[PDB]
Amino acid sequence: VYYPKKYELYKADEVPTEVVETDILIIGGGFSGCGAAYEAAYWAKLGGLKVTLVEKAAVERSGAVAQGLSAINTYIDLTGRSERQNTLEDYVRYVTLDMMGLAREDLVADYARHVDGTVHLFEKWGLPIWKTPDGKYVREGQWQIMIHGESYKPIIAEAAKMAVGEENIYERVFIFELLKDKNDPNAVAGAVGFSVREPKFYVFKAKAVILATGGATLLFRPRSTGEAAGRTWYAIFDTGSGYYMGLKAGAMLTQFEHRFIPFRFKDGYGPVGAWFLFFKCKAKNAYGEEYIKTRAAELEKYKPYGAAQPIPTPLRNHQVMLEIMDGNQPIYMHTEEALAELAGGDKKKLKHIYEEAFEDFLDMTVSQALLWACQNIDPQEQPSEAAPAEPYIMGSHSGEAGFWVCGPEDLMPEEYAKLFPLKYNRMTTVKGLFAIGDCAGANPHKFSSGSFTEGRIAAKAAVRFILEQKPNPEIDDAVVEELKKKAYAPMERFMQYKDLSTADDVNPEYILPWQGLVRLQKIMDEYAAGIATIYKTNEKMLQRALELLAFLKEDLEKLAARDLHELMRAWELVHRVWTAEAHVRHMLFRKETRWPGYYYRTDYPELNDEEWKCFVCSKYDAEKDEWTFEKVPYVQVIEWSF
Amino acid sequence: VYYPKKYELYKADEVPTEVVETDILIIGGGFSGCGAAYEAAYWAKLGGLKVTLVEKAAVERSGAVAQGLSAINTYIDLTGRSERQNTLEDYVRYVTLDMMGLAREDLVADYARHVDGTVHLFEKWGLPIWKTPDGKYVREGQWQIMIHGESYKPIIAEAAKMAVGEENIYERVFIFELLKDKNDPNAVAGAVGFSVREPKFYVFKAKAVILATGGATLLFRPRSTGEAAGRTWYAIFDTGSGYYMGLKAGAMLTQFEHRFIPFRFKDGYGPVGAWFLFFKCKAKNAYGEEYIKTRAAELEKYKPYGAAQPIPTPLRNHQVMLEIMDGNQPIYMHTEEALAELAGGDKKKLKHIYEEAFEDFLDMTVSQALLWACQNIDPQEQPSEAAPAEPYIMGSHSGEAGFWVCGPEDLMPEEYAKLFPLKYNRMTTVKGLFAIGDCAGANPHKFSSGSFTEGRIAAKAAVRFILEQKPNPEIDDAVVEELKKKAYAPMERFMQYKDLSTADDVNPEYILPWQGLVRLQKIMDEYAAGIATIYKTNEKMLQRALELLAFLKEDLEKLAARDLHELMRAWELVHRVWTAEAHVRHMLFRKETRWPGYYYRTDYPELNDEEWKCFVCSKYDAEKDEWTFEKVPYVQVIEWSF
Amino acid sequence: PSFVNPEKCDGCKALERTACEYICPNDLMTLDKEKMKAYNREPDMCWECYSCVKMCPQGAIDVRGYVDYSPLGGACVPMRGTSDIMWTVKYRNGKVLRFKFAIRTTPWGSIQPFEGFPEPTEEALKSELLAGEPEIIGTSEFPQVKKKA
Amino acid sequence: PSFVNPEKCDGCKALERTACEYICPNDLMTLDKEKMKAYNREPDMCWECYSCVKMCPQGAIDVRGYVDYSPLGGACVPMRGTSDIMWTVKYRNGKVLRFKFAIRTTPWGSIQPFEGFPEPTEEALKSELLAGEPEIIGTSEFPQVKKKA
Ligand SMILES: Cc1cc2c(cc1C)N(S(=O)(=O)O)[C@@H]1C(=O)NC(=O)N=C1N2C[C@H](O)[C@H](O)[C@H](O)COP(=O)(O)OP(=O)(O)OC[C@H]1O[C@@H](n2cnc3c(N)ncnc32)[C@H](O)[C@@H]1O
Ligand SMILES: Cc1cc2c(cc1C)N(S(=O)(=O)O)[C@@H]1C(=O)NC(=O)N=C1N2C[C@H](O)[C@H](O)[C@H](O)COP(=O)(O)OP(=O)(O)OC[C@H]1O[C@@H](n2cnc3c(N)ncnc32)[C@H](O)[C@@H]1O
Ligand code: SF4
């Protein structure tokens, strides 16, 4: 709910337009965007190219890494700088198996061979990595390393700022729509946005555009609906902006049905990675049973995925869901037993691991430490409850939803290149438009290091694309003006109909952003496998979701906004609604249940490797208002075995 | 969420006290309260007794019947004025079986032998009852008759007003606590309240007090959490006030674990009584399966409850719950097929029943007709989705939660009289304190007519009590002053700590009513068999609920309020929190699942007629702050066999 | 929830009391002394009971379905009289339905609470009989119910 | 959610920018030109990331746990420096914990993005190598991966 102190209204025609001409436009200054800005600045010199970074907030703390992170989840370690070395083949195998068999190995192997260099740069730039007395990076699990990362984002932001120059970074500018080449219906030409600090409309003309807006949250109703609706596990700041603009432009999406349901400390959603992998904490149901044991047999039907090590995350969730359905909650993270075991009676050792335990929270999700403080929970004395949160849509973490993107020429097989007009690393099916981080699908487990890395990859590819293809996109001024009117329409609608009621938020001719959002969350929660149904859905429910989303989409044409802040909220809602529709259509299309634990199609409860071992890709045609789906069979690109 | 336009703050010491002396004090001007006022006015003449009715809103439309009702759910018909006559023994058997074997038959038979007179008076007073061409009352099902009841409450309010006199009715006065006899720890002496229209503290001194505040809603998080959090199926106006004040006084509660889960049209919660019983509507899952038939086998284990006709409501609920757990939603009410079948090809007949269908909604839950309009749903063309709402606590409807009350001398067996110091009809275990309607437990299926009737019964008994025992309790002025300080404490706390933050609703030293309510709803939803877990709970979850409620109860001492409206909201929250605690403790005590469909104890999934065919009664001792429970075995009072 | 139309609301300043403020069962309707016009002070606590709507003499109050599940466009408008009530249901798609139902068969304020009832007596006070019984029940004798042997 | 202490907030004296308003990733912190003091404009959209808290030069911002699940009394207070950050955690029950963690091993603003890197070339633009590679990876050559036979 939002209650502005005062109005801040503008009519489209009263708003000045600022035109910005650049070569490479990066939308989103988070981890992937900063990686793109950093690398782009390096190669751009070859053609004296201009690189521009636009961010809706402030790059210093914007995005998922705002509070910092307690670990770098992706560090292969090909030389032995950490406590454990790994191979690239084992990593690729790991990711494909976690995806229950479906991952673009050309894309995964690609960011994996580059990621370590990115991590090494981070340390060089000042990021303090946990080290053993011997000087080795401290491992959390097999693929992650612990870090003192409170200033993780500020450090990376400084690197990007030093690389592209502050004069090329536009902050507090919300991008809401892409612009296409007037000369070519399947080519990008820039984007439009507006400032949230003043009345100013932005028109960015560019030769290449890189989507780095992060994923989408608040599509589904959370487990807390009051103030705590703000405590989403994933970045509440990311609202599927990239997904919206890209899909409207005609860029194909992939695996958009693949949402991620995080199992974390209940309510605060503090991290469990360190507790599970580093502290060796056990999770037990209300009766003291370690369900990863009691529910092990139930994974036998998922051969060979269920017999994989580590066990795929969705299957771990499935075990949790079985406990929940049987009514064995609360589920506890036995931190007290873990700390006691690790300390081994050594009081000084206990104090040290105790400090490590709290840092794991204070460096990334302070709310969990605050939750413990408010509820008088001392981890060395009592366990903490844990639970799965509502679904989130992103492609950099354990979820692989995002745009279908091209891979490197040396790894991408012919089977995966068919839909790309131009073969450039991380480019979407729309010429000149790239997608990175959460915006790039089918290659998850990137996390912080991998997302920055993917941005670097796309940035170099973008410079190459510009110098090789030499594009010269022309924006359609007629469309720009239409978009400018649309941009501020909510404010004009508020002024035009507010007199119909004595209450600004109870009007029959418009809905405010928070009202439309509550509605979206209810629809998704109840029909799109949200928490309301313990993540279950079926054809009828999904079809009803589309009907309700249709009503909502029509009502977006009657959105109202009272100030610039709420105008951004209005567009963030618009972005979320289309993201939700795409998610629903994708879930409806795949007639199987490949990721139990993330979602269940009760009408097609089994995993089908005979007919569905394929990536589901879709394209939205704005002109015809039609969605087209295609099945792209998975092919093993890298050598490995179960 | 609440955002007052401006402050309306008062300190206890600056608020004038108005002392009202009366003989009989009725708290709540709803259906049961009006029944009490009406009947008390008749007998009061015998002793020149004064009768006082206090209502927090306005009697004309206050309570559950604010919109009116489409039927009178309880009309036995012992002479044939309706389409179907019934016997009292059949009615008692019907209620006991619906309660899965647990009902105070002395109390049920008592209101049943009186209810028809009440209904006849209602018609005489102007209530239009549906009639056949032959002049017989139109039956909905076996026990209900259809009424044109838009003005049902206004008519009843008029009767009560003509009876007691307007000068004896206090409106817009919220009662928050009872007063006890200074010289008798188990006798009532009056009550305290405050105006919500002006700064005035009320002290009511009475010889007999009758609790008629209605049940409790909003204890559990609803299926809609935005504006629609206001669309509770049951009366949002009833917040368990009677439950709170009575339990604090030491009056014993009974069957407080027995909540009611209403199955209604989804979201709007329109009635299904007419659709099921009158229009012969069918309920089917997403695959066209009529689950009352496909799930018949699951009811066989319940003996003899599962073979009863009609099927007990909790078991009907259980069948749909199984469908929901299997993921076979949406659940549909096939109104289109019901109308087509009833009309039988006659277009004029169709138009008539079509109008009857809409009246069923417009006379009782306009929101459902509005929902249909907003969603373009025409009942003759397409079916509507239905769903069970969140739990509600009340004793007049299908739930029997409330105070343990005495029955009539001629029906109540010695087994049920042990806990009453004085044997007056409907008197609680606290001398001089009566409970009616939703406030009287163990005798459900009263509904509108039965609640008004139970009020009449308690009223006559109250007059008899006064004339026979000549009660003369004395209030404790010290306690009154402490309660006056507590009454306005929230406002004073707001003034004292508001300066700690620049935002009125984000303060570290206090919680506003809506903030404490959001917290309560979440706790109950997640641990006390709310919708979050499909109505399942266990010992561990309930124990955690008590720990969280403990934190909340402590924080109630830090409630803040910005105006009189919010001060009332503050006490309504206090009332719900204690009601919630009693509910949790009751569910925790009963080690069985007697009402699957209303709630499931996963740790005691079976119905236990060997050790749990008893009423569960509890007493809260405020001085010691201890709860005590005891089992009172059920005994069949009325002659009937399965 | 309910909302007030500024153009039709006159703050009941030509009446002895504010109708909407007086009738609301949840104390939501109140006056903005500044504009001298009413408003719903806490819409998420509105039960959409339509009491304020029916009692507003200016017909200035309407209801806009809860945003959680209501697409824009629908409306239910009542016109309450003395013996009946008229309703107009307007669908989002434009369809309009009209209904009319009876609400009372006697004049308002005409109830005589104990009409025909004999005076109460000390003897009667000790019985199970309520006012008007046993005849108001329709029987010459108080209804009997068989107790289990 | 975050909240500003009026007694410590100076609406950011004469500095060039309002810290809290500048840093918030969700655009929640803003100034009330009247009071010249900041506030969170939409607390239910607050991620409790503590960015505003850490950046307020007056330490006038704190966080009060979401009311949905937070009993009153708890607090986490950061004191962020240049090379480390200190935290004080106060429990509802009075318990007080103090920690201190490193946050950076180099001076702020000292990053040289391409330090030691060779200049880019048109030829290099066509390879799979990123800036600094394969040297920064630490391997004897650009990492190779086995393609499925
Ligand atoms: C939210 C969250 C995320 C993680 C974790 C815990 C929590 C609580 N933990 S673990 O415990 O789970 O394990 C991790 C951990 O310890 N270690 C690790 O490496 N990664 C973890 N992640 C993952 C990483 O953080 C993640 O992979 C990367 O940040 C993804 O990068 P990117 O895809 O670039 O998203 P971003 O959020 O950083 O940035 C997006 C930017 O876009 C802006 N933006 C969005 N829409 C925009 C628009 N319309 N116009 C202009 N700007 C617009 C954002 O403001 C932001 O600046
Ligand atoms: C909410 C609801 C209820 C029903 C139904 C549909 C819906 C949507 N439908 S069916 O479709 O389900 O079937 C019914 C139907 O068709 N026919 C029928 O006979 N009964 C139905 N009920 C049941 C009856 O309405 C019910 O049994 C009676 O109203 C119960 O009477 P009572 O127990 O007296 O509660 P009340 O709500 O009427 O009145 C309570 C009063 O107390 C006030 N109050 C509360 N707290 C107070 C305080 N602290 N201080 C001062 N006053 C304070 C209230 O303001 C109100 O005036
Ligand atoms: S009853 Fe109608 S005219 Fe009177 S104050 Fe309310 S809304 Fe305005």
Ligand code: SF4
């Ligand atoms: S609709 Fe009913 S609950 Fe809502 S404001 Fe009007 S009278 Fe009050």
Ligand code: SF4
């Ligand atoms: S940064 Fe601190 S001193 Fe400056 S405006 Fe914000 S709260 Fe006030």
Ligand code: SF4
């Ligand atoms: S805690 Fe973070 S999200 Fe909340 S107001 Fe501060 S900076 Fe913004």
